[PDB]
Design a protein around this ligand. Sequence first.
Ligand SMILES: Nc1ncnc2c1ncn2[C@@H]1O[C@H](COP(=O)(O)OP(=O)(O)OP(=O)(O)O)[C@@H](O)[C@H]1O
Ligand SMILES: [Mg+2]
Length: 496
Amino acid sequence: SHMRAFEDALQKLAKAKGFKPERRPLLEGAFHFITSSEKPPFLILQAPTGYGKTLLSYALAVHSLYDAKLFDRIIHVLPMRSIIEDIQKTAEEAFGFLHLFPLNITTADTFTWDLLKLNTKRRHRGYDYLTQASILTSLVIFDEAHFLLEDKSMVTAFLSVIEFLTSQKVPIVIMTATLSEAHKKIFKKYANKNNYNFKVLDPENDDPFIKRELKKDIKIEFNRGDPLNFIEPGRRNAIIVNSVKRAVEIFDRAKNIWPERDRVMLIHGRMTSSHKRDLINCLRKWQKEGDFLLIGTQAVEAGIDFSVDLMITDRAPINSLIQRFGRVARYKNEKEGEIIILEDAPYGPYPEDKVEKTLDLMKRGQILPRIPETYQTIVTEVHRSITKNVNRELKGELVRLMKDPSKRAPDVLSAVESLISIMRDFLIPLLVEDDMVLITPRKLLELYSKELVEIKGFNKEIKSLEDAYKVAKSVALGENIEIIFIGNYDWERGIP
Ligand SMILES: Nc1ncnc2c1ncn2[C@@H]1O[C@H](COP(=O)(O)OP(=O)(O)OP(=O)(O)O)[C@@H](O)[C@H]1O
Ligand SMILES: [Mg+2]
């Protein structure tokens, strides 16, 4: 065999999470492929939601302190909106992890700023890594995070970071339940262009996991109106919506509606890390004890491990919905669940094209979850096209800039300004008192007009979105400014 790192992680994790193992072949196959493998490996692990794919990351990480010929640490990338506190809290509790950590958990926009040599410091708080060069000595695992290609505002950048990563022959794993083949092709391209050892592992017809979940029946229904029309006390409930503001106002009423106020909970991303971890701890207590209602946004979807009897979610494109569906009957002796998609809900950040097409195709071909046969074709038809909006001459300059030591943040910033910028999505540190909260340039403006922000060390005192985009400019440059919250942070609602 020759993998006792893998089983070391499987035991230490299965202790902490209190489950008894099952062998999950694709995980083993993926671990071996990585540790074996002549060349730089480029794995696409295409496994259903709930398989246990985060194990591979844990395993590989407890394989970095023994063998370091291929990589010296693991960088685990979650999606942009995502909450990373849950994986951090089992890396810390289950395995005991500027310093060198075996397992670093980041978010996909942070990741690309880092590779663009931009200042991401207070995001990494000591600090786990702070340099492009540490990333180049890593194995980089995207955990459902490649879906930055479906964001118009980033695709050109995240593609340059895929191009550049592959150019430096960094080993790469791509974890996803929902792999389009438009996606598969641009990955395979860059993995072939740089002579990786490319490989796709999807489950095959005998998989002990798919059959565990074929036995389950989890009904999915469509509906309209207020999400609290559909709650069911006495079961584990979860309402997942597409914006934090939507989530907050549902929670403002759910606190009074739900029988036990103790068991109503709001999670989104506009909260402090301290707060997030507090909630993660309450949430793991809540799963073994009885019933509760959880209000959340997409932030809960790639990286948080919970399981809920009834789920009510907004309509969203198929990758997001599969993600969300995965959290309903997730563990093994849970065989019945219900899902309610709200076809009238607002799109939020999502493109309307893809959301509607998603809902048209599901309604034709009723899909059973965690069982790719049912959703694979929806995925490939929805999640296509990316090449349309790639500013491919900038994508070229970005890959030359990262490759060049002589070029730093100032040069990459004024490069993109020619071709205010992509800076729409450069989240900046709002400091609430000792903790912080990432917020978009635009909610920085909003919070400024309401006179809840004070900026030490910058003096144009924000109006005009372009003023905000300049705060983001200087934060990315490492300017000595502080963006401070003056209001009193709401310890259940997060930030406005
Ligand atoms: N070897 C294993 N055997 C049985 N169960 C496992 C194993 N590894 C992990 N799990 C289970 O899977 C759960 C974690 O799965 P996890 O959510 O990491 O899968 P995932 O592929 O990341 O799913 P998602 O796509 O929803 O993030 C744990 O609660 C644990 O019970
Ligand atoms: Mg995960």
